[PDB]
Design an enzyme around this catalytic site. Sequence first.
Site, PDB file in Angstrom:
ATOM      1  N   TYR A  44      37.538  49.351  39.634  1.00 30.70           N
ATOM      2  CA  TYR A  44      38.940  49.015  39.431  1.00 30.70           C
ATOM      3  C   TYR A  44      39.766  50.242  39.076  1.00 30.70           C
ATOM      4  CZ  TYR A  44      37.180  44.177  38.879  1.00 30.70           C
ATOM      5  OH  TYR A  44      36.573  42.968  39.123  1.00 30.70           O
ATOM      6  N   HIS A  61      39.702  35.826  28.478  1.00 33.15           N
ATOM      7  CA  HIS A  61      40.231  37.153  28.211  1.00 33.15           C
ATOM      8  C   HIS A  61      41.309  37.576  29.199  1.00 33.15           C
ATOM      9  CE1 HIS A  61      36.561  37.352  30.651  1.00 33.15           C
ATOM     10  NE2 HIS A  61      37.091  38.390  31.270  1.00 33.15           N
ATOM     11  N   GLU A  95      34.629  34.109  33.248  1.00 31.27           N
ATOM     12  CA  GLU A  95      33.995  34.579  34.469  1.00 31.27           C
ATOM     13  C   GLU A  95      33.603  33.449  35.390  1.00 31.27           C
ATOM     14  OE1 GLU A  95      35.060  37.768  32.957  1.00 31.27           O
ATOM     15  OE2 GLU A  95      33.955  37.945  34.858  1.00 31.27           O
ATOM     16  N   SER A 130      32.621  46.998  36.948  1.00 27.91           N
ATOM     17  CA  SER A 130      32.120  45.782  36.319  1.00 27.91           C
ATOM     18  C   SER A 130      31.327  44.891  37.266  1.00 27.91           C
ATOM     19  CB  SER A 130      33.270  44.964  35.727  1.00 27.91           C
ATOM     20  OG  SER A 130      34.038  44.352  36.742  1.00 27.91           O
ATOM     21  N   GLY A 185      31.082  41.547  43.317  1.00 32.90           N
ATOM     22  CA  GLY A 185      31.717  41.579  42.011  1.00 32.90           C
ATOM     23  C   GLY A 185      30.958  40.774  40.972  1.00 32.90           C
ATOM     24  N   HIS A 199      41.264  34.324  31.946  1.00 31.17           N
ATOM     25  CA  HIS A 199      40.192  33.687  32.689  1.00 31.17           C
ATOM     26  C   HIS A 199      38.831  33.867  32.021  1.00 31.17           C
ATOM     27  CE1 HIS A 199      39.653  37.874  33.752  1.00 31.17           C
ATOM     28  NE2 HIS A 199      38.439  37.560  34.176  1.00 31.17           N
TER      29      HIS A 199
HETATM   30 FE   LIG Z   1      36.804  38.855  33.350  1.00 31.23          FE
END
Ligand SMILES: [Fe+2]
Length: 349
Positions: free
Chosen positions: A176, A275, A189, A287, A169, A187
Amino acid sequence: ASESETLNPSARIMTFYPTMEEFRNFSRYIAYIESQGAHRAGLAKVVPPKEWKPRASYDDIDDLVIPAPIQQLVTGQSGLFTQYNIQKKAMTVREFRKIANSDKYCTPRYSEFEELERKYWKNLTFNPPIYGADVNGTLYEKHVDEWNIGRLRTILDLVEKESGITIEGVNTPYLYFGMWKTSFAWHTEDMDLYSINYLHFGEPKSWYSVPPEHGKRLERLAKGFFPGSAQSCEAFLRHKMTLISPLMLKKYGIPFDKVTQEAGEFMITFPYGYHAGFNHGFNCAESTNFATRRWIEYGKQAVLCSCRKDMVKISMDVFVRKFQPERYKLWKAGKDNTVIDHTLPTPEA
Ligand SMILES: [Fe+2]
Ligand SMILES: [Zn+2]
């Protein structure tokens, strides 16, 4: 009034429509976006040039396996919630879309987004949906050489090249599969990296984001409402279980912006950009994280989760030594006291 005033202290979410020419070089376009101040909002949208697509068709896919579907149980009231993830069991994409559309899990009647957004905040604690999240894999065809989430070619690769270490990831792509009311908590990254999200198809995904220049304020607010979690973990938000409504952010003066992402559109999160959001209905996104030279400093100062022993931690050593040789000694001896300027774009004078 130093040239910070690109995305003049409005640090709003910006949208870009690159040329197939500008689009070819990923790392280059991110640099361009930042010169336009897009990073100041913590989130940016990029619409691929019309003549572009990562895959011919997603007709051959209902057989794909979602090894760890997740039921999202949300608890809380009046703007503040905690999301617990009940891991369901092995499931195929066909079984998922059917549930995602079953009239009891599907999107409801809504005029404007404004209204869909309200139904989301009023009902997120009802009908625990299922999110086919963190599925290792890609939907990009091997020949797609532009913005291929599988191989972006950024310096994040140093991690792989230097130690052979793989981090699903982060260093690898994730898929997703969404459903209405499935959401992602607030959160930044892992290691405060950048992230890229492509919505392959389906209903929209709405996003909320707080300017990295105001990230610290969001944390203070979060700490105040969950003092219990704040004491047990230095970065409890990384647990991705905290939901906070836009109305609550408004009420406590925390600046933020909204944006809805649609099938075929790219979203880019920036270092230390908080975000969160939710999916409108049956969805499919992909992603991974990526880095930039500007990220290194964020990486060196990222505050990590101190309560889980399998949480992501990347050795910054190779980065400092390679891109900041003059400071290696200083840093390696816990001295480097560099303050980050969230407005400044990678290249410096
Ligand atoms: Fe994120
Ligand atoms: Zn923790």
